[model samples]
Target: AEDTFKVGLIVPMTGGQASTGKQIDNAIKLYIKKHGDTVAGKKIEVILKDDAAIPDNTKRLAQELIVNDKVNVIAGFGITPAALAAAPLATQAKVPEIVMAAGTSIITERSPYIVRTSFTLAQSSIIIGDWAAKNGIKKVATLTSDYAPGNDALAFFKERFTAGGGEIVEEIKVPLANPDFAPFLQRMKDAKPDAMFVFVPAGQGGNFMKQFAERGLDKSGIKVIGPGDVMDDDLLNSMGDAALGVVTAHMYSAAHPSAMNKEFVAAYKKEFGQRPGFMAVGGYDGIHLVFEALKKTGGKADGDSLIAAMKGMKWESPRGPISIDPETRDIVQNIYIRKVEKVDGELYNIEFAKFDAVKDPGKT
Candidate 1:
């Protein structure tokens, strides 16, 4: 029998972020399809487990992948909490984990075995703060889902915003599954600031954007700004005209002027019939990085070799050049500040400024 390298995917396939998880799955599949699903003559097998967006279940899934499946590598974490839950298991097993969706700094801070393809909340927040500072925005109000991912992003934004000499007038934390944001919207309306930052994710982001527009918060002279996830392709399609004019921070955009991005966007759109989202780019990059590292190791998909190859290693991806921090295994990449706009009859994010390179969690 031919030896196979199994790559485990533990994502929220049946929970709040199921849609996001599915997107990541599709992106990874697309990468495999494009790359022939193997490296160094070894057959690649993907083992998927539904984390269900629950911490205990996530840990159980990770355990199953390591103990039962004996996966050669672990990847795919659609949310921060799931990533946190699975981090220790991967670490204890000495398995390398390349997270496709989790963006919290705690993933790196807590486990050296975990590395992420997505920008950490701290990096994204610093990009927003730098953009706000350059734009002369002094007062800001923030809203976030009352969850690990949301709270982590909110804390980072608050820290960077305050450090930039900006004042946060109001802060709102809403339930992750709250369908009605009327109370929060009412509060935001009352305490108007120069810019409003939000950290809603997946399904909640669409609901929040719809409500924020229905309530006409955009017309209240408050500029909307936040992480790209809240106003990403999924939410933008739901918001339509309302998503226009909102500025957000991201590491990759379809409009980014890069040959790799153009190819990725085109291939992704052809495969999925739509442009790739930020999370999709992360998944694609994660798979490519894993492939690169495995190739370097001459098909040794073990933990130590993969980790060593990933650290301080630079690779050109659809998201441009991405390098892993040698210490924390966190990603270090260029961050872009973009404004959502309808350009050439299609919704796109246009880059306004680029944050050269932000510090990763490993350094801090």
Candidate 2:
């Protein structure tokens, strides 16, 4: 038998979410390029597969990777459904599954063998909820994609905001692949809330913002706020002036001011010709976990051994200081409150405040 470590990475390569998957793929490749391809005396090999953000395809691809390819670990899930579909197989096959970008809070609970390096929607949403309540925002409206992650975002934000004496005047759930935001925006405008919280998948932000600006909602005194997905750094430029002055809570920003993050951003832009987003950081950190765990285990690639090594492991990521929860196996890291601003004539999420070492609030 060859003494090599194989990681099966499943993500969307061709779909509406393709940009997200490409960011992850680019980051992983960037990590391997900068760091050596070998770790703990074992050559690290990644077998990349495309799931097209579909749940069934994720399951089937995960099966082939585990049964036929005999990969040491499975990683890279761009969305929650894809990750959930592969969870059973990871548990059944006892393969460590590292979620690189899925953010639903319960994903880690789906499989004992799963660990997440990604930011949960709840982690960021709770921060904004509390922040909004304290910062002169008395009433707000909420909108989210009708799915696990979106539900997580809405529920957590509502819990914290309501607890802090803020009123939710309206709640709206939109279809995941919905094309138009006009009806939802009109309804929110009718409610006349102080602010609006919106959560959609990363790639859908441009479309939403265009409609939002077109409807003149941007000038209606209803400030748009949500998790960073609505203003994902990768697509923020495409959103144009409509994205300006919008605030969000998230774990990363391409404009994060740190030496490590500056290096990461520069290198990523140099190699991939674009700024790396939260998904890219997730993929980078996921590989960091795998490589460090392999070192801890002395190259033993079994699921149990690697999972044990990853539990509670702490490291400084490009995003910030991060660790895996010993109990939940979910991510613990910083969440930043950022506003979209023109930095050197380009749209960027500029961090103004931070909540440090935030765990997934939904776990409680």
Candidate 3:
């Protein structure tokens, strides 16, 4: 007769990432379906909200989840803007917020109640920098959406690249919703960098890649690299052959050699009829992380206890073993450098190297 445990989910169910959001929603439900409806004898009730990836809307949704629905925990919200907005509300309310999609390191900087199941922009950029140094790429150009996530990635890469004896010759920031990238592509050609780094997501990413290839940038010998979002299946499917040879840093791929990944990918394909993206894996892992924490806390479901349980907590995720850094509460997961290639008439990210997990940014 215990009170049912209510978990709030805020995602862009109707906006830019509607497809990704829907996939994440289904992944969470799939977890609940497989694990039963309750944990520790308490029924799990999910309170879902469509933030539409908007900041004000996400903030209001988060407040409602905490003040109105009285959710025991908060989860979901893919983009960095939404996650950044929701973090303060969850922290003020003393509720644990497990972010499924946002990868900006800022989410955990000032909030003890926030933990992310996705790779931070800093982590991805560092991995890319390391790979670039290894490949002897000394000059680079950068392009990204003018957003918090994109800015974080650009700053991180610029700092890391320069520190490693590389130079950023050109930098361009395009509006997030810009439809035309011909100008940006033209600018990149003139800069003539040895390599290019881009940070575009969702529909913008598809369009950018399509145009980049059509404009002959792909064959220009300037290597392209960025976060895995740019090379995801949705964007790859849209870009077709153009997505090939693009390098990206990611936490999870269908080709990852973990038991959890194998099972999840097989089940995902069987259910959704498509390969799972890193965001989908992040959603799956985020929920399971919360479930494990709730179990460890004996279903107390209090904010402090949940945060304590999450610190330094290690879980076997589809992306392999990931641990929460005790200091930052940022997920410490492996980063992989991958090259997009066509195999069996479909695009696959072939892993080239694995970078050791940088567990704590606070220490660096």
Candidate 4:
């Protein structure tokens, strides 16, 4: 029998975040285009499943992949809840799992068998918190989704900011699928803080950005900020001028000036007809990470050997140089300070500064 490297990917293919699924799928295909569909004499096969952004469905699909397909590796989940649901199951089954997306700090910590090619929830908050303090924004407020990633971002920022001499005046957390952000915006506006930090996932980012402007909070001299997802590359064109002047902290940007990034950007546009975002980079890096580990093992290993190779592995990525922290299994990468800016007729999250090799302070 021919050796086959089967990687099961679970994503929200038919929900509010379905656009994210298409982006990741395109990115994985682009990686295949650049690097072929074979590694270490094994034919690469991608098995895809739609979790539909439902936690129950995510867990069920992942379980099915394990029993029925006997996949060599497992990956996917752009959202934290779904990723969180699948993490422990993969651990118990002893399958090497890579969370291609999600920044929730608790993800990798949940399972010894799982690691991420994506950033931690705390990574960008380190940038945003310190920036707010240094820039003389003393009084701050936060609006976040009532979920792990959102809660983690809010907690990390508050910890860092308060320690850095900034005060959080008020905080609010709405539902994960919240669409109408007017009441929350009004509450944050009424609190009259120096600035507000937000973390809304799924499809609420652009909506929150729009309502923030519509309710005149932008003109209230209150700056809005959060992680890169708040003014994400996927939502940049849609957010338009409403998203301008908003700054975020993130680990990757399609606009990184490195030669690697330039080529990645060009190829991504050619492949997907639009610019790649952080999640796109996540998928690309996820596959390469797997292949690198496979090459080390010569495609003759199970979940244990695969994960051992992945830990502490170093490589060049489209986003630039990166490595997996052997201990935490969280990404050690450059966290960037990006602002939503219009460049030559298009809006993009442009990097202004970077914190190199930023590591997450996990449960410490």
Q: What is the C-alpha lDDT of each candidate?
A: 0.79, 0.91, 0.79, 0.83
What tens digits encode model 3's per-residue C-alpha lDDT throughout 58-142? 8998898889888888898778888888877887889988888887667787577888887777778777876786779999888
Work out how many backbone clashes candidate 4 has: 0
What's the CA error at residue 230 for candidate 1, in Å? 1.1
Clashing pairs in 2: none
Residue pairs in steric clash, candidate 4?
A: none
What does candidate 1's lDDT look like per residue over 183-247, in tens digits? 87887788777888888775566777778888988678778898887877644554667778889
Kindly state the number of residue pairs that clash in model 2: 0
Overall local distance difference test of candidate 2:
0.91
Give residue 184's lDDT in candidate 3 (0 to 100).
77
| TM-score per candidate, chains pooled | 0.94, 0.98, 0.94, 0.96
- The best candidate in terms of TM-score: 2
Candidate maximizing lDDT: 2
Query: Compared to the true structure, candidate 4 yields what TM-score?
Result: 0.96
> What TM-score quantifies how close candidate 2 is to the native fold?
0.98
lDDT of 4: 0.83
Off by over 4 Å in 3: 360-363
TM-score of 1: 0.94
Per-residue C-alpha lDDT of model 2 across residues 146-210, encoded as one tens digit per residue? 89999999999999999999999888888876556889898876778889899998788888998
